[PDB]
Amino acid sequence: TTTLAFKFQHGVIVAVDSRATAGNYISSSRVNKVIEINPSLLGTMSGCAADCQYWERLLAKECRLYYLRNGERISVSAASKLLSNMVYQYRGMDLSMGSMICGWDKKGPGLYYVDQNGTRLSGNMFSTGSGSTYAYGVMDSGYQPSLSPEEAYELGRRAITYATHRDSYSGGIINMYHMKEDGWVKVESTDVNELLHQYQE
Template sequence: MAALANSFLSPESSRLKPGELSTGTTIMAVPFPGGVVLGADSRVSTGTYIANRTSDKIAQLSSKIFCCRSGSAADTQALTDYVRFYLQQWEVETGRNATVKVAAHLMRKICYQNKDNLSAGVIVGGWDEVDGGSVYNIPLGGTMIKMDCAIGGSGSTYIYGLTDALHKPNMTKAETVAMVKKSISHAMARDGSSGGIIRTCIVDESGVEREYIPGNQLPYGP
C-alpha cells in the first residue's frame, strides 16, 4: 500500500518531510469614545485546505472583554480558556470586574513564558470602568502594546495603508464599525488565507453587540 501511495507522488514531493502548515487570518480592533469594535474573518486554513469557513475568532474573556485570535487555532483556544478561567477566579477573589489591561497583561505573560511553544498573535479589547474602551495588541513573542488601531494576521499586511487612511481620532461608533468592516473585507479580497464572513463585536458600557456580514454582502466599495 505504501508503494502504491508513493507512486502517485512526484519525486520532489516524496522527499518532502512533514512540517508546519501555513495558516492565515485577519483580525482587527479599534476603540472609539465609549467603547471598542472588534472584527475578524472566519476562514481557518491548513495549508491550501480550508478546514472551517465560518469559525468564530472573537473569543469572550470576561463580560465586556474579548480577544481576537490569529495563528494556531489550538494554541489560541487554549490561551483564551486559561485567561478566561484566571479572570473568573480573580473577579471572585477581589469582588471586582476585571479590566482590559489586567486581561491583556495576563495574556501577555502566558504568551511570553511559552513563546517557544506557541504560535499565537492576539488582540485583547473591551470596555471597563477605568479606561473605557481600550485595545492591546499581543503579537508573536509576547510583546504587549496599547494601540488606537490594532490589526493582525496574514491579511493585515495588505491593509496597513488603508487603515492609516481611514482611521482618525474620536471616530463615532458608526464610523468605527464601517472602518472595521471595510478594512477586513479588503484584506479578505487580497489574502488567500482570509475569507468567509466578517464577524464584529461592539463593546461599550451598555453591553455587547455581535454581528456578522455574509460573504456576498461585504463592503468592497469606496
C-alpha cells in the same frame, strides 16, 4: 486570518474574518475568532487555532477566578498582562498566537496587542494575522477618532473585506463587535462576498 481593532469616540470596534486553513485547503469558512471572556472583555485570535483557543480560554478561566477572589472584574491591562505572562513561559517552543485584548474598565476603553513572543502593547488601533497589512491600509486611510458609530462599522467592514480579497488565507464572514461603556454588543455577521460585490457595484 485578518483581525482588527480600533478605539474611537464611541468605544472600540472589533472585527475578524472566519477562514481556517490547512495548507492550501480551506478547512472552515465559519470559524469564530473572537472569544467573549466576559460582558465587557473580548479577545481576538490569529495564528495557531489550537494555541489561540486554548490560551484564550485559559485567560478566561483566570479572569473568572480573579473576579470571584477580588470581588471585581479584572481590568483590560491586567487581563492582557496575564496572557502575556502565560505565553512567555513557553517562549521558543513554537507557539503561534497573535491576539488583541479589548474591553472597558475604570480607565475607559482599552486595547492591547499580545503575541506568543511576549510582546504586549497598548494602542489606539491594531491589526493581526496574515491579512493584517491590507487591513492597516484601509483602516488607516479612513480612521478618524470622531467617527460616528455607523461610520466606524463601515470602516471595520471595509478593512476586513479588502483583506479577504487580497489575502488567500482570509475570507468567509466578517464578525464585528462594538465595545461600549456598559459592555460589548455584537454588530453583525456579514458574508464578505456579499459585501465585496456591493462595493464593486
